[PDB]
Write a protein that binds this ligand. Structure first.
Ligand SMILES: *[C@@H]1O[C@H](CO)[C@@H](O[C@@H]2O[C@H](CO)[C@@H](O)[C@H](O)[C@H]2NC(C)=O)[C@H](O)[C@H]1NC(C)=O
Ligand SMILES: *[C@@H]1O[C@H](CO)[C@@H](O[C@@H]2O[C@H](CO)[C@@H](O)[C@H](O)[C@H]2NC(C)=O)[C@H](O)[C@H]1NC(C)=O
Ligand SMILES: *[C@@H]1O[C@H](CO)[C@@H](O)[C@H](O)[C@H]1NC(C)=O
Ligand SMILES: *[C@@H]1O[C@H](CO)[C@@H](O)[C@H](O)[C@H]1NC(C)=O
Ligand SMILES: *[C@@H]1O[C@H](CO)[C@@H](O)[C@H](O)[C@H]1NC(C)=O
Lengths: 50, 51, 98, 369, 453, 50, 46
């Protein structure tokens, strides 16, 4: 099963997901893709040095 | 924080090392020997300290 | 699914949060040491507030494209259009906007 | 219901004893036999094999004495045949010879018991002396085979291992070079497998090289003592006797026994044919021959004249027993025996080449390094 | 034979037949060391090898040398760069020195050889156990080697044929004596089966007769030159028993080297000729052989540049071309000591035309291919498991629209001159609508650079 | 499997194969795919007769 | 501990050590399972 924006999509509650969508292997085994409209990646965040 | 360190560059008294000793008077010695030998064979020890 | 983080994933169920904004608040209150997300968003975040800093490296090459289900012709049209933007400074303009 | 099987032996005496033995098996479907002589050359042997033998629609043959041509024939016909006397290595592998089995092990397998003899003496060191040939390569082969060891679980020391190896040409005039090499060797325990003239040469060589003294060891089997080699043979040298090997008749008999076992248990099976009669015009090997062979492999005879009989991966007599020998005052005496796991020392006190009852330890470590 | 010595006096013997049963030559060879008699089989199975002859035999045959037999097999592998293979034998002679030559050749070079497995069939037993069938079911290569008698090969081809090793993505290469005869085809032979033999057409049978005759000829001339005598042959196999110690045979040393008519027939001490004529044979679609190649002077010239292959019904191979571009592609000259590219590096072809005014278009010279995007093709390949090729690209760096057409790689796709392509692809709207795209695996874009002074 | 992958546990499953008790054996297919079993211990689900 | 015979092959061995930083991890098993997780290995407490 699924939940989330993916979910309402597969269930059909909407046509379009507009979002900073992570592009994985799995979802494409279900949902179609475009060219990327941005290039982001992983990172980490912490408090700046006093 | 980064504070302590050993004296000097790491000059060490009593040059020695860790290993695995076993039941004495076996044959399994040479076998495990060749083993961790192969462990530096793949150089997996790199991965090991890395972790 | 990976062998390496298996320790990590094992350790990371605990303190995870619902909305990354909450995390921003939390480390911003020093209730967190660090948080995991996709970079650009955070570059925007610390870029807004002096208190925080991007991580050292950059990894897991990734990107964003419009969510659409299964097979509907709309895919081609959309993406083609998005190139039809990246062809020009429209996107950079989008930086200028945000 | 007729059963035809051949033999070739030295004298008609073993023809008569041979057929009589076949009758002793009749009490154990009907048998029939055939036998002829040994040929001087190779060709006429096979000739009489077709004309005299194969024409009889023969299941098996018996051989003594390279006798190899017989097997060449049997092989082109793929027909299993078992003789007696050959200890030659040519029958080691199935390589040239598909279907063949033996009553006794080859010269090689002496070492098999040698190693365990060391275990009776707890020796960590050896001296391997062999010329190189088919035979020798066999010797070193199985030798090192046992010498691949220490898969366990004993051996209060580091364990037995091969000290050094030496090859030399057969029929060599003088090998003494490798002997002086053996002088600096770390041990006094020498091992030898060599032919007749070979053994003579190496013994005399030892005499000049005066390694015949105290603390030295010499490990050989029975092949050495026989022949003129005994004349030059060194004092008190360790030796062996393959049990009964010189005995033609009883071996022929027990062979016939194994044959019978194959008859009763095998022929109860189905899809059976008969080998061809005439050699001429027949190119087709007998479809069942290999199966008959495998039956010979699985064959286990509980009661023989010589007792139980066994076979190896190559179908060769296994867990066979030996007579263990030594020289005393130019006279050989039987010092012990072997079954499969151990040597049984007899009541006699084992005599070493040197002084009395001291069993020396050849591990002596030269302060020269 | 014996009566052949009794009737006339034969200092020598020539033997041949068309049959497939080599044991003929076996026991013949035996007789060689028996009678101290030179005998030359020139043809047929009588040429086939029996491993490890007698040290006292004088015998010879015309047939490839076991070591260099499988070595020719190796160069065969060197043609089309077939890396993934196995070898299968029985207890039949030669396997030991065989394998030794195999691996010994393998690990000693910069080449990228990879050997999966080797298994040993049993033809001695019959099959209730499918053990043959099973360990054949363990075979992962697209092509594998088999070493055995044609008779055995029948049963093998049958069983493995049931296992499904005979399809596309499957081929077999066997030594010469394996399939043996030109004209005798057991049907169960695999389609498009591969081997190599002494030339069927280019090598004449009577010519061979002359070959051996001349061999023994000049040889006897070599003893008569030096010694000026030859041992009187023993005319009776019976009487041969007393002549053992009498005859002193030095002949071998001269027998080995024979220089005549410009084509050296010289053998070697192990029972093989130095440079025998060798010809690659391949099975047609009609199950009738044709001479598909030749191995001469320790060298190869193939009849085709690229391998003929059918693929009736599964198109599981694809076409790819790109330009080497820094960094993403390596292209280098193959090593002279091998002739293919090394390590994990992959092959490619070069379409360079010679003259502007001519066509003459085989248009290929193999050259190295390796590097990053190459390895992208690698990973994806081993993932979805499908074949791939690459070759140099003629026209332009990437591609453009001149007037109504496209001058470049992508265009080289749109005309279906090639199925796929790689390299550095600006992914645009322009080139988009004519083609299709993936997720991009590299993030990049327009940028400029200068020097900080 | 549903139990398997859902936990922090380190479970590792090698293989699962399906025997045929319908046919009889000339093919050793049962025998073979059993010959594919690498575990020190494995589970079997079937009738005592089988 | 599991009863096991091993008549004739002693192919199992005995090992004990103290957890020592870094080189050993020792932790409480997860309550929702009861064994240790991931690649982590068991041990006993005397
Ligand atoms: C074997 O007997 C003597 C043993 O010494 C041999 O003499 C040695 O021969 C080798 C090889 O020819 C030489 O390298 C040594 O220098 C010789 N040493 C001495 C002390 O003579 C003799 O050569 C051999 N017998 C024959 C007939 O050659
Ligand atoms: C050959 O003799 C030895 C000497 O006893 C036998 O060794 C015994 O073997 C039995 C079983 O085979 C063991 O239970 C004994 O512990 C062994 N005792 C000794 C002293 O070795 C050996 O079994 C005999 N050969 C055969 C084939 O039975
Ligand atoms: C062969 O063995 C038998 C039985 O041990 C014995 O008679 C003798 O050693 C040999 N046979 C003859 C007839 O000498
Ligand atoms: C040959 O023998 C086999 C083994 O018993 C048996 O199937 C039958 O007798 C023959 N084979 C066939 C296929 O009939
Ligand atoms: C080749 O023939 C010549 C002719 O005399 C001879 O000298 C030479 O030894 C031969 N080659 C070999 C390897 O014997």
């Amino acid at each position: 099963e699924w939940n989330g924006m993916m979910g309402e999509l597969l269930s059909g509650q909407a046509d379009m997901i507009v979002a900073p969508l992570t592009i994985n292997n799995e979802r494409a085994q279900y949902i179609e893709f475009s060219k990327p409209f941005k290039y982001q990646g992983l990172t980490i965040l912490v408090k700046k040095e006093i | 924080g980064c504070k302590l360190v050993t004296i000097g560059s790491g000059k060490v008294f009593a040059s020695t090392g860790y290993g695995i000793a076993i039941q004495k008077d076996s044959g399994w010695k040479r076998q495990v020997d060749l083993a961790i030998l192969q462990l530096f064979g793949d150089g997996e020890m790199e991965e090991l300290e890395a972790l | 699914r990976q062998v390496e983080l298996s320790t990590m994933y094992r350790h990371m169920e605990k303190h995870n949060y619902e909305s990354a904004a909450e995390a921003i608040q939390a480390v911003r209150d020093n209730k967190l040491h660090a948080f995991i997300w996709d970079s650009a968003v955070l570059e925007f975040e610390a870029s807004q507030k002096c208190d925080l800093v991007t991580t050292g490296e950059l990894f897991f090459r990734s990107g964003f494209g419009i969510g659409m289900r299964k097979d509907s012709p709309w895919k081609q049209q959309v993406s083609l259009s998005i190139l039809k933007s990246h062809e020009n400074g429209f996107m950079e303009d989008l930086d200028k906007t945000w | 219901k007729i059963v035809n099987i051949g033999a070739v032996l030295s004298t008609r005496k073993h023809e008569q004893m041979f057929r009589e033995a076949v009758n002793q098996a009749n009490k154990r479907i009907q048998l029939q036999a055939t036998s002829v002589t040994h040929k001087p050359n190779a060709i006429q042997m096979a000739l009489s094999v077709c004309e005299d033998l194969i024409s009889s629609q023969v299941y098996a043959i018996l051989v003594s004495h390279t006798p190899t041509p017989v097997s060449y024939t049997a092989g082109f016909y793929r027909i299993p045949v078992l003789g007696l006397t050959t200890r030659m290595s040519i029958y080691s592998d199935k390589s040239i010879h598909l279907s063949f089995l033996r009553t006794v092990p080859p010269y090689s397998h002496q070492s098999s018991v040698w190693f365990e003899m060391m275990r009776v003496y707890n020796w960590n060191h050896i001296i391997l002396l062999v010329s190189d040939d088919h035979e020798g390569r066999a010797a070193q082969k199985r030798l090192e085979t046992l010498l691949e060891e220490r898969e366990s679980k004993y051996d209060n020391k580091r364990g037995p291992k091969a000290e050094k190896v030496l090859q030399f040409d057969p029929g060599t005039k003088n090998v003494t070079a490798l002997l002086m090499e053996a002088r600096e060797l770390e041990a006094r325990v020498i091992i030898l497998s060599a032919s007749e003239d070979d053994a003579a040469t190496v013994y005399r060589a030892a005499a000049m090289l005066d390694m015949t003294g105290s603390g030295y060891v010499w490990l050989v089997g029975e092949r050495e003592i026989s022949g003129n080699a005994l004349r030059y043979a060194p004092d008190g040298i360790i030796g062996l006797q393959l049990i009964n090997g010189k005995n033609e008749s009883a071996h022929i008999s027990d062979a016939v026994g194994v044959v019978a076992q194959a008859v009763h248990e095998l022929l109860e099976k189905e899809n059976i044919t008969d080998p061809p009669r005439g050699c001429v015009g027949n190119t087709n090997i007998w479809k069942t021959g290999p199966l008959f062979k495998r039956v010979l492999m699985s064959s286990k005879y509980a009661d023989g004249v010589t007792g139980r009989v066994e076979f190896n991966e190559d179908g060769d007599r296994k867990f066979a027993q030996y007579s263990i020998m030594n020289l005393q005052n130019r006279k050989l005496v039987q010092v012990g025996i072997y079954n499969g796991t151990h040597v049984i020392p007899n009541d006699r006190k084992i005599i070493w080449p040197g002084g009395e009852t001291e069993k020396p330890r050849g591990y002596q470590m030269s302060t020269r390094l | 034979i014996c009566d052949l010595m009794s009737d006339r006096k034969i200092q020598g013997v020539v033997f041949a037949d068309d049959t497939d049963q080599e044991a003929i030559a076996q026991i013949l060879d035996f007789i060689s060391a028996q009678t101290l008699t030179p005998i030359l089989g020139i043809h047929g199975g009588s040429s086939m090898i029996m491993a490890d002859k007698d040290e006292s035999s004088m015998f010879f045959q015309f047939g490839p040398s076991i070591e260099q037999q499988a070595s020719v097999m190796l160069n065969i592998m060197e043609e089309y760069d077939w890396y993934i293979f196995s070898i299968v034998t029985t207890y039949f002679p030669g396997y030991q020195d065989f394998v030794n030559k195999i691996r010994s050749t393998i690990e000693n070079s910069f080449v990228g050889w990879e050997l999966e497995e080797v298994l040993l069939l049993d033809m001695s037993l019959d099959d209730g156990d499918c053990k043959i069938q099973n360990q054949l079911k363990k075979l992962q290569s697209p092509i594998i080697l088999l070493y055995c008698t044609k008779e055995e090969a029948t049963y093998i081809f049958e069983v493995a044929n049931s296992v499904g090793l005979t399809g596309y993505g499957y081929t077999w290469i066997v030594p010469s004596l394996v399939a043996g005869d030109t004209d005798t085809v057991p049907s169960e032979f695999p389609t498009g089966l591969i081997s190599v033999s002494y030339d069927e057409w280019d090598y004449g049978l009577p010519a061979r007769v002359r070959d051996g005759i001349a061999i023994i000829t000049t040889a006897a001339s070599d003893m008569l030159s030096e010694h000026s005598f030859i041992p009187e042959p023993k005319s009776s196999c019976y009487n041969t028993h007393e002549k053992r110690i009498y005859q002193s045979n030095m002949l071998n040393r001269y027998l080995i080297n024979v220089t005549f008519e410009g084509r050296d027939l010289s053998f070697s001490e192990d029972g093989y000729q130095m440079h025998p004529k060798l010809v690659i044979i391949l099975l047609n679609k009609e199950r009738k052989w044709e001479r598909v190649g030749k191995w001469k002077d320790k060298s190869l010239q193939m009849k085709y540049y690229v391998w003929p292959r059918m693929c009736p019904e599964t198109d599981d191979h694809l076409s790819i071309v790109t330009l080497e571009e820094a960094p993403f592609v390596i292209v280098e000259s193959v090593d002279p000591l091998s002739g293919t590219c090394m390590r994990n590096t992959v092959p490619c072809q070069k379409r360079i035309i010679s003259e502007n005014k001519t066509d003459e278009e085989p248009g290929y010279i193999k050259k190295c291919c390796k590097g990053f995007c190459i390895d992208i093709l690698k990973k994806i390949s081993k993932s979805v498991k499908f074949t791939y090729d690459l070759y140099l690209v003629t026209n332009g760096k990437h591609g453009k629209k001149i007037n109504g057409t496209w001058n470049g790689m992508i265009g080289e796709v749109v005309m279906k001159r090639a199925y796929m392509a790689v390299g550095s692809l600006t992914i645009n709207e322009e080139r988009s609508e004519v083609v299709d795209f993936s997720v991009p695996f590299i993030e990049t874009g327009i940028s400029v650079m200068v020097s900080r002074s």
